[PDB]
C-alpha cells in the first residue's frame with residue numbers, strides 16, 4: 001500500500017511486547033518499509049486461500065490474542081532479513097530485496113508452516129501439538145531460508161538433496177535464533193511445540209536421535225515417506241553442522257569446533273556458490289570443504305574440522 005511508515009506496538013505468541021514497523025493509510029497495515037522492498041504480513045482468516053488480506057488494524061496497537069501470530073511473523077521476518085543482510089550481505093531472499101510476504105491464521109488447527117514458492121505460511125497449531133508457529137524465530141527463519149535456497153542452490157525437495165534443503169533451513173533458522181540471542185539453542189521449534197510438555201522440540205541438531213532422526217549415514221532412511229525422509233535424513237547434516245560449530249566426539253570421531261559464525265560463512269558459501277539442485281550428501285561434503293578452503297585456506301583448522309565432521313556422520 002502507499003502510505004507513511006509508522007511504528008506499532010503489540011505482543012507476540014509468547015506474550016512478549018515488541019515494536020513493529022507498520023504503514024498508515026486510513027488503517028495501520030503490517031507493512032514494514034524499512035527493509036528492502038517491504039515486509040508484508042497477511043491474514044488468511046482461518047481459510048486456505050492465499051495470501052489473504054494485508055493485515056489492517058485501526059489503532060496501531062496489536063495486543064489482541066488474534067494479533068499475536070501476525071506480530072511475530074512480521075517481526076521475525078524483519079530479524080531474519082537483518083541477519084542475511086548484516087551477516088551475509090544478502091538483500092532479501094532473492095539477493096535483490098524481493099518483498100517478503102507472510103500469511104498467518106492459515107486453515108484451522110493447522111500444525112505446520114511452509115514456503116509455497118512465493119510466500120511464508122503459518123498455521124495456528126491445534127493448541128496441543130503446536131501453538132501458532134510464527135512464535136518460533138527458528139521456524140520463521142527456517143521458512144524464509146527455504147526461499148533463499150530456492151533462489152540459489154535450488155535443492156530439489158526429495159531424497160538427499162531434499163534432506164540438505166531441510167538442514168540448510170534448520171541451520172540458518174538456528175543461526176538466526178542465536179543472532180537474535182533470546183534463549184538460543186540447537187533445537188528446532190521448541191518455543192511453539194507441545195505447550196503442555198517442557199524441554200522437547202520438533203528436531204534436535206545436537207542430538208537428532210532424541211526424536212528418532214538419524215545421526216549417521218549408516219542410519220539413513222530410504223523409504224518413500226516424507227519425500228524420501230527430507231525431515232529425517234536432515235539430522236545427518238544437522239549433526240554435521242552442529243559438530244563443525246560446537247565440536248565433540250561422535251561414534252569415536254573427534255571434531256574441533258570453529259564456532260557458529262564460521263559455520264554460517266561456510267554453509268552460506270556452499271549454498272550460494274557450490275550446491276546444485278541435485279546435490280547429494282557426498283557433494284555437500286565437497287562443497288563445504290571447498291567453501292572452507294576458499295574462506296580460510298587449504299591448511300586451515302576450518303577445513304580440517306569440516307572433514308572431521310562429515311567423517312563423524314559417515315559421509316565421504
Ligand SMILES: CC(=O)Oc1c(C)cccc1C(=O)O
Nearest residue numbers: 111112113114138139142143
Ligand atoms: C520449521 C519446520 O520444519 O516447519 C515445518 C513444519 C512445522 C511442518 C511441516 C514442514 C515444515 C518445513 O518448514 O519443512
Ligand SMILES: [Ca+2]
Nearest residue numbers: 057059061062
Ligand atoms: Ca489494534
Ligand SMILES: [Ca+2]
Nearest residue numbers: 183184185190
Ligand atoms: Ca530457543
Ligand SMILES: [Ca+2]
Nearest residue numbers: 138187188189
Ligand atoms: Ca531453537
Ligand SMILES: [Ca+2]
Nearest residue numbers: 193194195197
Ligand atoms: Ca513443548
Ligand SMILES: [Zn+2]
Nearest residue numbers: 142146166169
Ligand atoms: Zn522446511
